[PDB]
Design a protein around this ligand. Structure first.
Ligand code: MG
Ligand code: MG
Ligand code: MG
Ligand code: MG
Ligand code: MG
Ligand code: MG
Ligand code: MG
Lengths: 130, 136
RNA sequence: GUUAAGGAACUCGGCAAAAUGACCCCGUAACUUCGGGAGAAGGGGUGCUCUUUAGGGUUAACGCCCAGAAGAGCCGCAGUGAAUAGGCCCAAGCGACUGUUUAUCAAAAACACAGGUCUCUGCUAAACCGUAAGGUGAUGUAUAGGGGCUGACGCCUGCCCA
RNA sequence: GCCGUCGAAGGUGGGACAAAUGAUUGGGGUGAAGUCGUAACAAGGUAGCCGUAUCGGAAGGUGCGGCUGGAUCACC
RNA sequence: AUUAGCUAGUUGGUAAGGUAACGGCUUACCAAGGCAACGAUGCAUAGCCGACCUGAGAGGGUGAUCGGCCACACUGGAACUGAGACACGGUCCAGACUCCUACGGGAGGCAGCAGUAGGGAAUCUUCCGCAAUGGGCGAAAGCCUGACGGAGCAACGCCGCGUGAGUGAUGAAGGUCUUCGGAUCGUAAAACUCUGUUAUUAGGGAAGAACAUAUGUGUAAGUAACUGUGCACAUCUUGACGGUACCUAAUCAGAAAGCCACGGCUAACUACGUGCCAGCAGCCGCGGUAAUACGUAGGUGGCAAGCGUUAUCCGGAAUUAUUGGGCGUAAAGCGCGCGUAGGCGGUUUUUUAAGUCUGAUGUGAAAGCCCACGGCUCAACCGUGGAGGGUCAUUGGAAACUGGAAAACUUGAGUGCAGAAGAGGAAAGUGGAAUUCCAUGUGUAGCGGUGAAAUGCGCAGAGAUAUGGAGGAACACCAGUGGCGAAGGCGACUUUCUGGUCUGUAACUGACGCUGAUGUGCGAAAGCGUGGGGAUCAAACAGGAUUAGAUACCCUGGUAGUCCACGCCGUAAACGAUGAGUGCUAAGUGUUAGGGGGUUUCCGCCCCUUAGUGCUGCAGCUAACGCAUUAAGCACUCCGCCUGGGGAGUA
RNA sequence: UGGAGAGUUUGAUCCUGGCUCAGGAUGAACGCUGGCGGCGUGCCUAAUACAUGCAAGUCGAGCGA
């Protein structure tokens, strides 16, 4: 059946960018309400709402493009999927494209970016890349 | 494949085999050193003066020496160079490497330190054949 | 009846004799129709006296018969001390088996056999005994009766109808 | 000095696993094709192929099922 | 794992004995367990770590000198003394070997330091010696020290270093190439000029040696610096190597340089001899009358006191791929269901800290690689510092996800109710049309078969032709892209019994899931076993010709088999050549069974929503073909398999 | 801190795919040549019988004689 839907959200990030859609209506929860509101403060999405009912409330996504109708999000890569777990080192997590992107870690403090982990040296699960 | 399966059976890699079979292993002990390992070199003892041909399209003639090695087993050979001061049952040093387009011959008889000692007729390619010149 | 050293050298041939033999234990191969092989083979122990303890039935119970364990000890060359009681193993040949045969020179590899087929018989059946009457087959009726060949089981049974 | 428990080596016997070897024997690759036929690839001149039987010197041939990886006009 | 069971004092209590102690540690009655698909047991190969090798790293291969630990002493047991040996150089015994005795007996154990013998393609002096550091003994001088301080020998490995340079045009002699009308090496050589690291001449001559001993006068017991010390010095003393390391002064640039290659790769070309020959070869191969790819001289290139060849190992090889692959046709998706362990599991809040995170301590000893420096004249090596181990134990904080624990949630999955469509099975009847064989007539010389013909049945009345009755088997027309079952598959009709799927949803407890290594159950036909029944078609089989030859192909004949009941065997181009499960992303055009908006116009119509079913076609992916909402697209989970072609799905 | 490639199936291609070479190593052997100052490492194959040498003693302020 549907195992780990966190990848299925990040699948539909890639689906709408590829055929250049605008509106994305997926169900999401408080795990994923913590997810997409990272990149809105990083420059990938126009606006992220809040989930309506916190269980069955769909989180609508309106994607951000360029002025030339040029694509902002290049691609996405899961890292720690069910069957192989990846956890970050102290200061030794790797960089996305020599630092030009967001690597999403959910440390012992909550979902942060890989930039915010180098002020407190934490590890946590390296969930996805950009 | 799947990381579950890779735990249950690892990557048992590809075995290879020696290109030259009849040397370099612990063989068949029989309360003495009945047969042994020769990693680069050995002695020999000869059995036959050899004359043969290549077989593919080629039509030349070749001069091997079918021997019995110092570990009970049977191999062919070849004498590089010109001279042949060899007869049946004379000691010959060995060194490996097959000869292409001959159907079954195995190694090279070392022209330096054996009864195959020194080959005259060569003056420039020298240490591949064991020829001296003490002027230079 | 016994015999020194040797043990089939005897001889058509281990022919006759000699060894093995009971009960209680450990252990047992190839091969197969899964039952068998198997008592396979090769091995050990046994006598008398004395001390303790656990075992049925009979009986109110002393009493009586049935038994098995360890331990300690004694004696002889030898302890089922006399008589009675399998020698075993490897590989082939023919017949599957138990059976039966030449009373009185032949006990088998011959005869039977369970099974396979082939043919004949619609009932007052065919077949056989009897010149006939009468009977057997049968108070049975094609899953049953008489005859010819082969001889469990396994895999099979090839061409010729002048 | 003698008696007893435990105890290497030795002797006896039936097994178990590899290895060396053996009269003949059955396929296999290698060559160089001399010997006998053309079974595939064109509709290869009987369309091929996969299972499964039975026969023949030699590829192979026929039977019953499935497949197109079956030309013509793709078999209307 | 082409090895699945395994130990029996084995597993346990109890008892007393037993060694430094626990102890089936060895024995005795009872007791029914140990281990195991998470690899128990049994075979062949092996000393193991710190480190060495290669690599971008992750990893692969190795176990030598050098340190820590371990075992063993020609072979197999057993002891004794002492603080803590089953004792290498001791010891009693037993075995196979050497050799002597008076043949009664005894002796011998160089895997100590070397040297000889021996299988070998292969590894060295039978060297003086205790001065330094370390060890036994003694209160000290000292004593034995094959530990060791060092030398004798091999390019064995790395390092450093020379065989010289400054000056020195007329292409001097002269080689093979050439119109040899000529070039090349080549200021090279021939000379001229300095130098002497190195050495063909001997010698002064190490810091490495601090001490000990006492004696020079100090530490307390100084009573007593005699004693343990030598806490003034340790000063009448301690160097085989060593007339060494070093270094000056001399006739002399004079003794001191190779080796492999030179088509393409791959760094480096020319002229003849031989001319598919003597050869050569890492592959393409260059060789049938020279041939830039064979020997030769010239020429060049490489490295350099060293150059090539071999056998072996790692990289090249993303060619076992966790970092870093693949399955439609190229190697690779089980023939397909139910399914145990196992793997993975939606959402919510609250704890727990088991993973994960970071803090703290202790430890994973020297020595190597690296990060640095006085010095050996640099350097190889030494010296000091530095980084380098945890998948660990334990010692606090954090609660984000994965996980045990408390509570409710309803999209997934299941039932209830309302409804249809079916060749989905399994027993029992029943019906029609064609094939074959028997009964009679009318009837009669042909029926067949074919590229052509026959073999054969017929004239004894065959086929043709009619009624007749005997059997057995398939199931025309509907029938089509349709339907159904997980697959193999299932098409005449009626009846009793019997599974699953779907449409619409008010109901219902409330994650009850997906995948499945072994296990287990169905499997097209052919084939086999024991019984029935046997029309047609028909392997095997006999026949005629086609064929030089013919089971072949073609023709009339023909048995096992085909059908049923029962028990087996389980394979196929068992195919969509595409494993299952969930979500996802441009659209047009059919068709079948159902539901949504109409007076429901009836197979009129358009308007929609859901599930199977076919076609055409963007982005994307693909070697290309071609898929392309029923993906071969983007992702997640779990299972199966592949690693050149034969040998071979064989032994 | 730092990570290369070339050749070969066809008349000619793209792909899958093997095999082969260049490089680093050796307590290596063996082939030719030979100046060394200086530093290291030299039974890895029959566990094939081991001459001749030296490797465990010390204590004469134990105590005898
Ligand atoms: Mg017997
Ligand atoms: Mg027997
Ligand atoms: Mg009568
Ligand atoms: Mg099929
Ligand atoms: Mg010693
Ligand atoms: Mg020494
Ligand atoms: Mg059938």
């Amino acid at each position: 059946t549907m195992t780990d839907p966190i990848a299925d959200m990040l699948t539909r990030v890639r689906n709408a960018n590829m055929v250049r859609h605008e509106k994305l209506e997926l169900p999401a929860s408080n795990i994923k309400k913590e997810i997409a509101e990272i990149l809105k403060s990083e420059g990938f999405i126009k606006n992220v709402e809040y989930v309506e009912d916190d269980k069955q409330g769909v989180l609508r996504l309106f994607l951000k493009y360029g002025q030339n109708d040029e694509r902002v999000i290049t691609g996405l890569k899961r890292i720690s999927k069910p069957g192989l777990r990846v956890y970050a080192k102290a200061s030794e997590m790797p960089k996305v494209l020599n630092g030009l992107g967001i690597a999403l870690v959910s440390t012992s403090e909550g979902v942060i970016t890989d930039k915010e982990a180098r002020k407190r040296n934490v590890g946590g699960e390296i969930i996805a890349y950009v | 494949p799947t990381i579950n399966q890779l735990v249950r059976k690892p990557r048992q890699s590809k075995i290879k085999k020696s290109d030259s079979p009849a040397l370099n292993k612990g063989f068949n002990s029989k309360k003495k050193k009945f047969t042994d390992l020769n990693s680069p070199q050995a002695r020999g003892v000869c059995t036959r003066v050899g004359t043969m041909t290549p077989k593919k399209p080629n039509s030349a003639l070749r001069k091997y020496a079918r021997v019995r090695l110092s570990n009970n087993i049977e191999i062919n050979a070849y004498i590089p160079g010109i001279g042949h001061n060899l007869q049946e049952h004379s000691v010959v040093l060995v060194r490996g490497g097959r000869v292409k387009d001959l159907p079954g011959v195995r190694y090279h008889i070392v022209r330096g330190a054996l009864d195959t000692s020194g080959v005259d007729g060569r003056r420039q390619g020298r240490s591949l054949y064991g020829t001296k010149k003490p002027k230079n």
